[model samples]
Target chain A: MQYFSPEQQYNAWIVSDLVKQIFHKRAGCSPGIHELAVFAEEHFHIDIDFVFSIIMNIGDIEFALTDEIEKKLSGYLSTLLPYVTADMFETSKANAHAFLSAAYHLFV
Target chain B: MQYFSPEQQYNAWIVSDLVKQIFHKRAGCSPGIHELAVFAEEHFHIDIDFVFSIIMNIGDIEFALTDEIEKKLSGYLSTLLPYVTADMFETSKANAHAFLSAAYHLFV
Candidate 1:
């Protein structure tokens, strides 16, 4: 269950919206990078600015998916987004290279 | 809070690394495939990879109880890691599947 920030969500929204345009009907939210950031600050309650940096690190790839796979994939990933969100949340800061080194396999 | 590209933090690390290892290690770095090759290229700012294929997209069924459940499930549609970490500085790509499926049942 990974998390997307507001900004990321915004980007995801743009992608989801595109899905809607190409396929028709609303797809759904991407996740919420800002929301994830807030959760980190509010829940486990950690302070971080890398929120965008973190999201961008990962968002960079996500943005491409819209072009690479079916528009429906946005909705597809949304379901398990939390786990991946959590995976990234936990790993990134502690070990950036390691996180990407491992995660780079989920492509369609 | 999403920015891990140091090489170490980018991927999970252990099962954060292991999940991808055997589950894919040396685990392969997972996959230096497609556009991910660019992210893994040894020189890039704010990059990501798999960056997608493994959620397997089956993130819901295979998504792991992830550990957090309702307990560690804090912020942004549930953190998924079960509060394993403070939950911050990461977002987006890591969380790209399942599309928000609700998994609930009578229990096996």
Candidate 2:
């Protein structure tokens, strides 16, 4: 929770590249740490579809994000971004979405 | 290339579950070893979309399967399924699609 280990970083490689391309697509420019911070804080929405898309490695299956789970996940990223160090964020295979997914995998 | 280790198997967990639900949805029955054999040998479709969906952990992005990469990936499951022993297939977090994705990750 406090830090993303090397293995998490390795697993994160895919998401980091993915989010970068998506960010570039929407903004027409590469994202920086400030953008990542904003993405982790607000622009990135996480409902059931996003959760399953990132966690289970499945195509996004849209559905409700039930009150129970939403409440559990409400403070997730808004609080997590501050905890993650820049070293973790800019590592060879890491990013905000990756950290978000790694944490979301435990939402049972 | 030969067997999915504990780590690879762990990573395969998500694919295995996703494929099973898909199989169930299509067949209206749970899959068995014979079905798995069939799925491995003929059913699993892995073009560019499938590859990115599984590996980079994103939704399917449909595109042509270029001859170069297609040829490299052609014999992938067709030839490898027979070599995968039942133990490897039925492990806690292993399956044909998982093995397929694990192999496809190196199609460069």
Candidate 3:
């Protein structure tokens, strides 16, 4: 049969404080932008400055979910956050965007 | 001690597409191009669809460092295209955008 979908696990990881502590201990820095810089630099050979700058910009941009973007992301999110609602995201746009962007920034 | 980083092993798997072969042999679907979706999914437990979609948009829109994305993803290309660079990912941007939108659409 099937276990929790990949999205489910992902969401869980996003909110976990333990992840930050682990990264802090292992990465030798606090887990936000600094930890990210190290992770990207070491793991991907991506420029640390590049990642740092882009992510910093991304973090500060005023973000909102549009119908178009939402429409597009729905199919995938359905399985991922199957029980979520539009209001849930809209109400917490900042947190939502932060989480989503942070998630993206890691791989971006 | 000498060995590839776990993330490196993950990169190898992404490019090998052998993971796809293995998954196809035993499971239904395979993973994404950027090592992010699978790596974040497996190691940190981030949502794969979230990772997938974010990386997709990140891949298509203004991605210069995507060679890194491509290098790891090149394997998916073997089964799917080339590595995850812009030149290679260019062909797949539409799908990437579609998938990214789809993933976020659920909760948006």
Candidate 4:
């Protein structure tokens, strides 16, 4: 079993797009869950340990459809809005740059 | 006690600076431990659970000192270089923007 299968790859791509949609529409920024996790962890002390678990296991679940993952991700993102608002984008420019790099490397 | 004290505030400021120096010198990027954690978690499957513990308790330890934080942060950063490099910056432009905002908000 590969770590990331084709379906998982497709899921990551689609999931990333959905996440981008939220950020771009609301704040005109494009970031992944990792970046949001970093922000929440640093500013709000929000624990994103679950997100890592989700990512790690995303490929392992055979019955989990993309829609399910999408819904769960959307829900997770909604809760992070308080910490990941437009203002946060302007403040953590350097960290944003670094995270952008990581997301690109991982998904794109 | 508060989550973050004046000393911890000063420590965060200094630690952030030292981290910036390493990235700036090596890859010309300025990222915080949170950003690095995200990268490692995504690409290399590296766990940064301990980092959050360190940040949360940094204020509680009176004798830890700024140099101690600096040294620990530097050591932690050194381990993530394989996953976080200059190339990542170009790939995840959008994510970088968001993380940069968070770093600025937390430190500056």
Candidate 5:
């Protein structure tokens, strides 16, 4: 999980702080979505926006991707990590994991 | 975990109902507390109250028990079962499990 070391802020509110200590950066969007978006954009040179639009806005053409979201996210991340914008994507992943862990409420 | 039958109630109220539906025959009082209490109370002709008092209130003269609570509870329950109150305790467990399952909130 990302933690903002009691210093720094992004977008004026410290997205880093939020990600590190409160809600996770990884949660707002599932892992699969992250992976696929990066994969298409980095490897196939597929338009990221176009792919995202199709995946998210299927327009009542409901498809079963929810269960596969985690795996897909993981796959996408690994696939795109070594390609274009690797450092930035990796940073995003770290931030997202931190955010998710922080935000998650474990009853146990 | 203890489960309450759709019918029947103890104490003219329904301890069984609560146990069987909300918390497992095991939560609320940590598992260890339950076990130690049962064991001492049942064996060696020890008074249930005495064991309970020792287990429940050492007057904050606390020892290293918090971490072992679960294991202790399990141990006590198993040890005391065949001696004084086997069937009833087992039944309570069932009810308690049901209760715990229903009441525990898993925010996935």
Candidate 6:
């Protein structure tokens, strides 16, 4: 059975894009959790946790996507590197991995 | 280079084990976000979002794991199914997938 559908894939793209935009707009310095929360609340009217959660979710689950989407994601990460400290980025990435590994066997 | 070390992998397992314990303890019915928050706060001294973020992280990132870890995760999911609605579980699973797909291109 298919775990991820086309619509779900598109929705994931939207979340990633929005996250990239948020990082881009605040390219001046490293944005912390508080800053992300403010931006998400002000612009997208979403909780920062929800935004991060969606991102963490993406890393955890398997889904179908196209070449363009992959490129966009890589581009965003490249741009995002300078915006945060290595520790912060690692924590974020670590958190993503932690979520998925916990649930991987279930889905697969 | 190895993306996930033994320590990191163990940590992910710990997070997953804790989550499964939480689910099992509250096996009465579908627990909502707030309930999870309460449980996390009281017991784990962590935010529910943090717990979930870790789970999402596990799914998103590539990590080295053992066969035992896989078995434990599968066992937890089997038990967790009866406690949560299909939609809630799906949402959780979807969130995991979304996070990973968005970040896949960057790490790979």
Every model's DockQ: 0.03, 0.01, 0.02, 0.04, 0.01, 0.12
Candidate 1 residue A21 C-alpha distance from true site, Å: 4.4
- Rank the models by lDDT, top first: 6, 4, 2, 3, 5, 1
Q: Which of the predicted structures, 1 or 5, would earn the higher TM-score when compared with the native?
A: 1
State each model's CA lDDT, in order.
Answer: 0.27, 0.38, 0.31, 0.38, 0.29, 0.39
| Candidate 2 structure quality by residue, lDDT tens digits, B2-108 | 12233332333433444445456567765542243246336565232233233333332233234433343433434334444454445423443442333323222
lDDT tens digits, residues A25-72, model 2?
Answer: 567665542244346336554232233233333332233234433343
Candidate 5 differs from the real structure by a C-alpha RMSD in angstroms, to one decimal, of 21.5
Candidate 4, A1-108: lDDT as tens digits: 114333333333333333334445556544444464455456444344433323222112333455664555455445445435565433333332322222322221
* TM-score of each prediction: 0.21, 0.25, 0.27, 0.26, 0.20, 0.35
Native-referenced Cα lDDT, model 4: 0.38
TM-score of 1: 0.21
Off by over 4 Å in 4: A1-49, A54-63, A89-97, A100-108, B1-48, B51-108
Tens-digit per-residue lDDT, B28-91, candidate 4? 5444444645554564443344333232221123335555645554554454443355644332
Using TM-score as the measure, the top candidate is 6
**Each model's fraction of native contacts:** 0.03, 0.00, 0.00, 0.00, 0.00, 0.23
The alpha-carbon deviation from the true structure for residue B8 of candidate 1, after best TM-score superposition, in angstroms, is 27
Error of 4 at A13 (Å): 14
Please give, for residues A1-108, the per-residue lDDT of candidate 5 as tens digits: 111121111111112122222122334532222343344455445333322222212111122243333333334334434443544444543443432222321111
How many clashes in each candidate?
Answer: 78, 0, 20, 22, 36, 34
Q: B1-108 in candidate 5: lDDT tens per residue?
A: 012221211111112222222223344432222233244444423333322212211111122243343343334434444443446544454543432222221111
Q: Candidates ranked by TM-score, best first? A: 6, 3, 4, 2, 1, 5
How many angstroms is residue A99 displaced in model 2 relative to the true structure, after the best TM-score fit? Answer: 13
Alpha-carbon runs more than 4 Å astray in model 2: A1-84, A90-108, B1-22, B25-69, B72-108
- CAPRI-style quality class for the chain A–B interface of candidate 2: incorrect
